Amino acid sequence: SLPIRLLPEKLPPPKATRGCRLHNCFDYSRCPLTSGFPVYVYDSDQFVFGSYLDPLVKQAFQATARANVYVTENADIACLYVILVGEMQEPVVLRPAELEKQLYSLPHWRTDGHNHVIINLSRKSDTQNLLYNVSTGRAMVAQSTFYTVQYRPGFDLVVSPLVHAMSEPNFMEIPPQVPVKRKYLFTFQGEKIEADYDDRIIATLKAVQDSKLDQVLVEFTCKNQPKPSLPTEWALCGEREDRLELLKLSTFALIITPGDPRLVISSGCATRLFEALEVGAVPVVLGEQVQLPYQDMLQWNEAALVVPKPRVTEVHFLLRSLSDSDLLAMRRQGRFLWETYFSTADSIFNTVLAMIRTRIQIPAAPIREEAAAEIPHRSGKETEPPYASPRYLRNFTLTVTDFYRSWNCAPGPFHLFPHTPFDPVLPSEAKFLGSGTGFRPIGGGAGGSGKEFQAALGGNVPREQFTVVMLTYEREEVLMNSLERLNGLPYLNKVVVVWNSPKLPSEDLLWPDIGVPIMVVRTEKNSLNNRFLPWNEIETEAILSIDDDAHLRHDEIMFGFRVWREARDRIVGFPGRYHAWDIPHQSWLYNSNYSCELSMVLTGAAFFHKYYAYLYSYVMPQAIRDMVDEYINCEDIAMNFLVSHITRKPPIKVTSRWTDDSHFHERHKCINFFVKVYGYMPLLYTQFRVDSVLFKTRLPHDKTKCFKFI
Amino acid sequence: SLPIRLLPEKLPPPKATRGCRLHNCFDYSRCPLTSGFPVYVYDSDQFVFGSYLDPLVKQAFQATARANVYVTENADIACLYVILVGEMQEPVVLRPAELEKQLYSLPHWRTDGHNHVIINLSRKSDTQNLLYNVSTGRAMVAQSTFYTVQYRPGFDLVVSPLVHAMSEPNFMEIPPQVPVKRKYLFTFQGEKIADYDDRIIATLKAVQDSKLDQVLVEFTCKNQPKPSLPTEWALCGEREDRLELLKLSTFALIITPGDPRLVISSGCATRLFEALEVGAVPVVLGEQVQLPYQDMLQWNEAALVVPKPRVTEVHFLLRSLSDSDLLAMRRQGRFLWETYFSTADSIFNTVLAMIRTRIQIPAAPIREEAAAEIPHRSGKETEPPYASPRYLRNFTLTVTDFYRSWNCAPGPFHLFPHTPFDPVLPSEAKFLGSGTGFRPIGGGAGGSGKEFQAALGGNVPREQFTVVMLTYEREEVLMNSLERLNGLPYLNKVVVVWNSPKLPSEDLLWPDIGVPIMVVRTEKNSLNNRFLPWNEIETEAILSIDDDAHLRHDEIMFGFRVWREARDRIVGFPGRYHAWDIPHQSWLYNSNYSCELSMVLTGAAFFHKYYAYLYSYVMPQAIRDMVDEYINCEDIAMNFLVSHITRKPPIKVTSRWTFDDSHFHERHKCINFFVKVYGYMPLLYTQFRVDSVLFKTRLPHDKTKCFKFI
Ligand SMILES: *[C@@H]1O[C@H](CO)[C@@H](O[C@@H]2O[C@H](CO)[C@@H](O[C@@H]3O[C@H](CO[C@H]4O[C@H](CO)[C@@H](O)[C@H](O)[C@@H]4O)[C@@H](O)[C@H](O[C@H]4O[C@H](CO)[C@@H](O)[C@H](O)[C@@H]4O)[C@@H]3O)[C@H](O)[C@H]2NC(C)=O)[C@H](O)[C@H]1NC(C)=O
Ligand SMILES: *[C@@H]1O[C@H](CO)[C@@H](O[C@@H]2O[C@H](CO)[C@@H](O[C@@H]3O[C@H](CO[C@H]4O[C@H](CO)[C@@H](O)[C@H](O)[C@@H]4O)[C@@H](O)[C@H](O[C@H]4O[C@H](CO)[C@@H](O)[C@H](O)[C@@H]4O)[C@@H]3O)[C@H](O)[C@H]2NC(C)=O)[C@H](O)[C@H]1NC(C)=O
Ligand SMILES: *[C@@H]1O[C@H](CO)[C@@H](O[C@@H]2O[C@H](CO)[C@@H](O)[C@H](O)[C@H]2NC(C)=O)[C@H](O)[C@H]1NC(C)=O
Ligand SMILES: *[C@@H]1O[C@H](CO)[C@@H](O[C@@H]2O[C@H](CO)[C@@H](O)[C@H](O)[C@H]2NC(C)=O)[C@H](O)[C@H]1NC(C)=O
Ligand SMILES: O=c1ccn([C@@H]2O[C@H](COP(=O)(O)OP(=O)(O)O)[C@@H](O)[C@H]2O)c(=O)[nH]1
Ligand SMILES: O=c1ccn([C@@H]2O[C@H](COP(=O)(O)OP(=O)(O)O)[C@@H](O)[C@H]2O)c(=O)[nH]1
Ligand SMILES: [Mn+2]
Ligand SMILES: [Mn+2]
Known part of the structure; x- marks a missing residue:
């Protein structure tokens, strides 16, 4: 009511x-x-x-x-x-x-x-x-x-x-976030045309410059005339383009708030903040009385040092005491804030809108999805029928209760997703004590060895199914065969086949019958980005993304699925690769050699959450999809960049499986361009893979391995 | 200055x-x-x-x-x-x-x-x-x-x-957190002696009268109400009467005073106190209110705070919260209540911590365990031991990391020398100016097993580990396990916790293993002593090892490398699990071979020294008391602590399982007592273990496995 x-x-x-x-x-x-x-x-x-x-x-x-x-x-x-x-x-x-x-x-x-x-x-x-x-x-x-x-x-x-x-802003004119320390430790440019702490600030900052303990550049008059400003403000100098040239060279940028404490915020103060975040200079705001843009929702200390004017005598020590990983964390959060809430009119x-809406407790609009045109077809010749994952169970909780992450962690608060990999897990007694709908604990909760294991998903979340998404193009014969290898796959909800070829499938085609639906979707154009669209026919949270020519056994698919149900925010998969540092050229290379350390898992054979499909298709920068369509290449690299950026974790590689020239060199170009779009390299390394618990373990006779082979 | x-x-x-x-x-x-x-x-x-x-x-x-x-x-x-x-x-x-x-x-x-x-x-x-x-x-x-x-x-x-x-509050009178839903959906008791109050009463009565849920709302008291400020809904009865109904409430209503100028009152804060105390999720009607510590705590994670005009939607809203979200709010209320409300301390x-934090000063350093070394005499890669750097984040953990500092366990009262939550550098920073201490495999080209053995690699600078080894009346086995350590890469030193009341014999020849062997004296004989933060431990990494453990060198090196990438977890060899006792609705310790694990015993595991400080000085005394009573269960307690902090299972390395009855049944009693202390079971399940990336993989001839056997 x-x-x-x-x-x-x-x-x-x-x-x-x-x-x-x-x-x-x-x-x-x-x-x-x-x-x-x-x-x-x-x-x-x-x-x-x-x-x-x-x-x-x-x-x-x-x-x-x-x-x-x-x-x-x-x-x-x-x-x-x-x-x-x-x-x-x-x-x-x-x-x-x-x-x-x-x-x-x-x-x-x-x-x-x-x-x-x-x-x-x-x-x-x-x-x-x-x-x-x-x-x-x-x-x-x-x-x-x-x-x-x-x-x-x-x-x-x-x-x-x-x-x-x-x-539109040009993300390519933004200096890279690394190296951490730039030419100047800090800079400031302004002019004031006349409790008064202003005079001790100036004297302290001049003394730092003259000590020559760090390279700094502080200037309290302008070369030409200053822009007009409100009384007691430190007026801006030059044009936007002059100030940026200096800020692009600064580790930190000073922002000295107005002398009148009643000036809570001004156009000029926010401009300085805007310009410093734009190019990665970590703001240093002197004066705690200021109200920064969006302060009710944003935790500004994560992207800026806010310091009382009386502590100016300690700023130099403080700026020298911050480690490189803390300082780079601050720069990386200032980029998130600046891109998401400052950079354009949108x-x-x-x-x-989202501020007013959150203050009155209403959830965001539901992120759109890819309405699919099914290509109807005719088919040739555990004990239950397909069940979809429930949707939209957290409207109030993700809007109000998770307030902090909604606004201070990527991707931000603007969309409502049908589900996400960050839903909190129940403590492990709740399934026995009133919250057991859908749980299937191994051995009724007493556990066991391989017999009991294969009879139940187990884990820390209720049971569910997964959807296969299989991209295909001009390969009508191998498609039918790999579609058949999926007959009998446990927990399979349906297969989505993305039809990229411009020529429809022949009318006279007898698709196999595999026990679950096979929807063939039409694509307005031929793109590898189409494998990551959030098709409305995908009714599960889990996706098994697979090439129309990939050969996974059923046991591999099942072990991977159980790993992913315990690592829901990760790419969990089979083909491991890694990025290599080109020592003389100071740049990155794609490397697919056998290796003891990995950082990518290719999406030609991997599980991931549908959440990342929405992100890949509608939230990630257009310049990255643009490049995937240009080279008809690298969509698997872009998706490892996205997931490792959001989570700050490496992927997970499952089992010991491991499987022209202008294509291979397109993948060095991609890694290095994607780093320019993000501002940094998000990929991280792992020095292990996962196997089942009793892989290659000698057992007594009253016990069985979890899997025969993996 | x-x-x-x-x-x-x-x-x-x-x-x-x-x-x-x-x-x-x-x-x-x-x-x-x-x-x-x-x-x-x-x-x-x-x-x-x-x-x-x-x-x-x-x-x-x-x-x-x-x-x-x-x-x-x-x-x-x-x-x-x-x-x-x-x-x-x-x-x-x-x-x-x-x-x-x-x-x-x-x-x-x-x-x-x-x-x-x-x-x-x-x-x-x-x-x-x-x-x-x-x-x-x-x-x-x-x-x-x-x-x-x-x-x-x-x-x-x-x-x-x-x-x-x-x-002292009694943690055993606090009802358990599970089952999520209790007898009443919500309750309220008070008496009162724009004006929205009349519609609130009318609305809540209609909910009671609808019999769609079991609720209990009472707008007068049985006896005379406690005196209160004007327009306040005054408390009824005594503390012990109110708590008996709250113990049976999923949610507790708090209706803020009618005069909006009354920002907070003792009576409102008492209702918040008593609701959190017994796990009723507060539902506060009136956003004008300032709740205790509100400048630091994100109260929306523990309470629903709702405008008085939305009373007509409260019923709908309480039914729409999922079980895992309600439980997470109950678990957060307990953290807040215990850390900031429960006692005079x-x-x-x-x-003190609020005012200190507001002026940017870090917390006092947590104490450590001053070791009394017992001097002894010894018998008969290329560098000398290096300790881990300490206290590198004083400003960042106090101001920058404000949100987690206050809203995640253990809270903001102590400064630790280091933590497992330090942010990681993006992987190009080691090559572009932040490379101090980094040892990338193949200089950043990577490689196979040859190069992998030459360099720790990973995402963090190199470091060493300290063996901590507990002993008691086993003089001969000790010397021999100490000698297995001779030659171990990256070992800083061996701290031997001497738990026997009789000092070592003066005529003892300890082996010379190439690093110092510190033998520390204990004021009493406790298993808790293996988790004291001895000031002799100069590293972040600890390899906790019983005096009778046989780890090979390769096992230790792969375990050390896993931990360097999983610094907040127990990373170890002996997997175990907690099994549900179906008829008695309670837990059991189980060590059988299993496909699903929830514990790694610290008799052979790596963990961060941070958790020794927590185990010794922050974790409830009742848990260490029980460990001393039975001389048992220190490894179950530390698995409880770390899984409580991280809400993740431990990590199990390699296929190793190999290493009286009143001891086994003491372990059932520990698991179920600890669950009473915490209010819930923190353990969680994992259905995998880790092995090197090229374990049991068929390799060309120009490639070598990462390890010979693992
Ligand atoms: C398995 O692992 C090996 C070993 O790491 C990889 O081998 C490297 O491959 C890369 C790329 O193909 C090579 O790096 C490139 O070198 C070019 C010049 O190389 C010559 O010199 C070396 C020895 O000095 C010879 O071995 C080689 O045969 C050549 O004759 C540069 O021009 C390249 O730079 C290009 O891209 C960068 C972007 O990063 C631009 O800056 C440049 O302008 C240019 O456009 C690049 O540096 C490297 O030399 C190889 N190493 C060795 C030891 O041979 C394999 O590629 C890998 N296999 C797979 C499948 O990934
Ligand atoms: C390897 O895996 C097996 C299988 O899960 C484990 O076997 C179980 O061990 C537990 C504990 O030792 C047993 O649980 C206890 O059962 C008692 C009654 O058991 C009798 O009945 C069964 C069949 O009905 C017989 O097989 C058995 O031999 C007995 O004759 C209960 O009284 C116990 O309750 C006690 O603790 C609870 C706390 O949870 C208290 O509330 C109680 O008051 C009481 O004090 C308990 O429920 C279980 O029966 C065993 N199962 C089987 C099939 O034998 C192994 O223990 C495990 N081994 C290792 C090393 O981990
Ligand atoms: C959570 O939000 C979603 C999306 O706004 C709500 O779903 C809509 O519900 C209405 C009413 O049933 C339907 O007509 C729409 O078709 C739904 N939209 C979509 C995209 O599914 C959902 O009802 C909300 N849930 C709660 C508990 O408030
Ligand atoms: C970070 O905090 C620690 C802990 O208070 C500081 O360490 C103390 O520093 C003083 C002066 O250097 C010494 O006399 C004490 O002995 C130190 N205490 C300990 C426990 O080591 C440290 O100096 C602070 N660092 C920064 C950069 O502010
Ligand atoms: O223009 C193209 C080329 C390829 N593909 C699909 O992209 C995937 C990867 O191509 P391919 O398997 O040929 O590469 P490989 O894995 O063999 O290196 C397959 O699912 C193809 O059907 C596509 O959709 N459009
Ligand atoms: O009163 C005691 C009994 C045992 N221990 C130590 O506790 C560890 C584990 O005990 P034990 O190896 O006997 O148990 P097991 O692992 O063999 O079951 C060893 O380091 C013992 O020296 C101890 O410090 N004090
Ligand atoms: Mn392929
Ligand atoms: Mn032992």
């Missing part, structure tokens, strides 16, 4: 509007937990704001809003109303009290603005503060500049400046 | 005291980052407060403070000054403005109380607000009742009520 309705205003004083929070100014009755999060976006061209808006801000905002999955044209169902009011073109023509009157005139303002968010995105000006003397009713405000008297914490949003309006709009 | 000094008051208005924050009212010059965190505690028996204090509060606080590592009697070096002012015996004699004057009279108040924390711990009263009319200068306040006017976020502290004053440690 519907949430209780907020009672509206029947004008309100500034004490009242400063007192607004969700618990007294937001109408939850428009927003049932199960009605989605429909968002109404006002067309700013119908209101006075449109013609005063900065043109690039307006254009990038309208294009993002048009493409957004939550936006609805039906104001009657909307939970949230968005009005874009800035930033405005300078000099600001419109007077404050006029800006107020047009806000109170918006079509769905009702009496007070409840459930509206006012968006005001900075791009060229660091001195605008359009809403300062404006009464906003019960609306929330999203902008980059706030004084204390205007910031309502937990209700307003501090957001990032819009830099890449009507453009990033920013998705962050505003 | 010292931090910049805060400029003192030369009386201040209420607008000034309400704006105090660390950035304008704390004097960082008393608190350099590297001078520790010395705390001065005023003796409240010298000031007016002492005779009015509740005597049990006063006695429990003074006891904790006398035993606290940070506390000093030298007020000249102190960074923080602590004064206990409450709670006071009822009816409260002392008038407000008097309490103000004794505060300004404190010996080291100086002019304004800077760097003072005022502590006011509740126990018996739910109506006290001692400091409401009291000017506090620049001092922080730590207490359980705050109105909005008085609460300074980020500066004041919301703490737990002091329930077990001068007592918990509370006082938490107040």
